[PDB]
């Protein structure tokens, strides 16, 4: 089944009447507008393309404005694509809301996880530090050894080293759907989702099950 594009708003708790407090993430999922529908004949695969929110009229460039006017919908802040299964079909210019997610139990939430910048090996790969004392000299959080001697005489690919950590596409799977709230455009899922507050997320029905 297709998904919907929302934005992470923040986290809250939900107290329920047997007195347990469910940590929930609130995702504002307002009406996504289907812009382009792709098919096996013209494009070679079946997908829909949706847009959401609004964007400044002076900053929607002419190709984007032409595309949105061809679909006949107001310009949004981006374009995303969802692959279609066989039993389901959509039309161009069509609004989708959270009432689609009214009857799902678990979702997969995809978002761009926060950037930690250039991070070290201890933060990035759970490496162990060496001794802070006992003679240790300028080698407390260093990576250690990165190879073997003459054979092979090289560092193997995929060696866990320091570098850019975070700011990258991350999926959290099989999160419970605590509440679907159609009139306020809210999806409350149980647990944390990737990314910062006020940020784009793609929520799909769960693929594992």
């Amino acid at each position: 089944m297709i998904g919907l594009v929302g934005k992470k708003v923040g986290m809250t708790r939900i107290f329920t009447e047997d007195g347990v407090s469910i940590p929930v993430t609130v995702i504002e999922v307002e009406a996504n507008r289907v812009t382009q529908v792709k098919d096996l004949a013209n494009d070679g695969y079946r997908a829909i393309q949706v847009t959401t929110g609004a964007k400044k009229a002076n900053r929607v460039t002419k190709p984007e404005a032409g595309h949105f006017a061809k679909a006949g919908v107001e310009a949004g802040r981006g374009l995303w694509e969802f692959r279609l299964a066989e039993g389901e079909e959509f039309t161009v210019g069509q609004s989708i809301s959270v009432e689609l997610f009214a009857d799902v139990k678990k979702v997969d939430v995809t978002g761009t996880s926060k950037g930690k910048g250039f991070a070290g090996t201890v933060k990035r790969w759970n490496f162990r530090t060496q001794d802070a004392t006992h003679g240790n000299s300028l080698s407390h959080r260093v990576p250690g050894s990165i190879g073997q001697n003459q054979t092979p005489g090289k560092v193997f690919k995929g060696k866990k080293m320091a570098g850019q950590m975070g700011n990258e596409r991350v999926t959290v799977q099989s999160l419970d759907v605590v509440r679907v709230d159609a009139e306020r455009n809210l999806l409350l899922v149980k647990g944390a989702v990737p990314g910062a507050t006020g940020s784009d997320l793609i929520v799909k029905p769960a693929v594992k099950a």
Partner: protein, 123 residues
């Protein structure tokens, strides 16, 4: 959060006063043992006429921790000590006949119903 080499008080009347957690049973590379958890102990102090002597190695159940338990609404119950109840190596029922101090509902299982029955206060 009790680990190896940790000194714990005895919350029963077996005859020991202090014990030392020397192993956290029930898993490989297991680090900590929370409230309601079986550990292996050795006895470091003893009452002169107790049921156990200094230097015995036997089991114990951690029943109070300063780290405390968390309750499903988000609550936390903390104590001002680490306290355990001694158990036989094989039977894993308590040695003493009375338990001092409060214990927690996290021990409410069939394995520790004797402790729950004899406790003065169950929080």
């Amino acid at each position: 959060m009790i680990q190896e080499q940790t000194m714990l008080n005895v919350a029963d009347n077996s005859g020991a006063r202090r014990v030392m957690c020397i192993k956290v049973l029930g898993g490989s590379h297991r680090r900590y043992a929370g409230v309601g958890d079986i550990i292996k102990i050795t006895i470091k102090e003893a009452i002169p006429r107790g049921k156990v002597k200094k230097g015995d190695v036997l089991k114990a159940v951690v029943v109070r921790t300063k780290k405390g338990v968390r309750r499903p609404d988000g609550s936390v119950i903390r104590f001002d000590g680490n306290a355990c109840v001694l158990l036989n190596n094989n039977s894993e029922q308590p040695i003493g006949t009375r338990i001092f101090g409060p214990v927690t509902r996290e021990l409410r299982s069939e394995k520790f119903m004797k402790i729950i029955s004899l406790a003065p206060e169950v929080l």
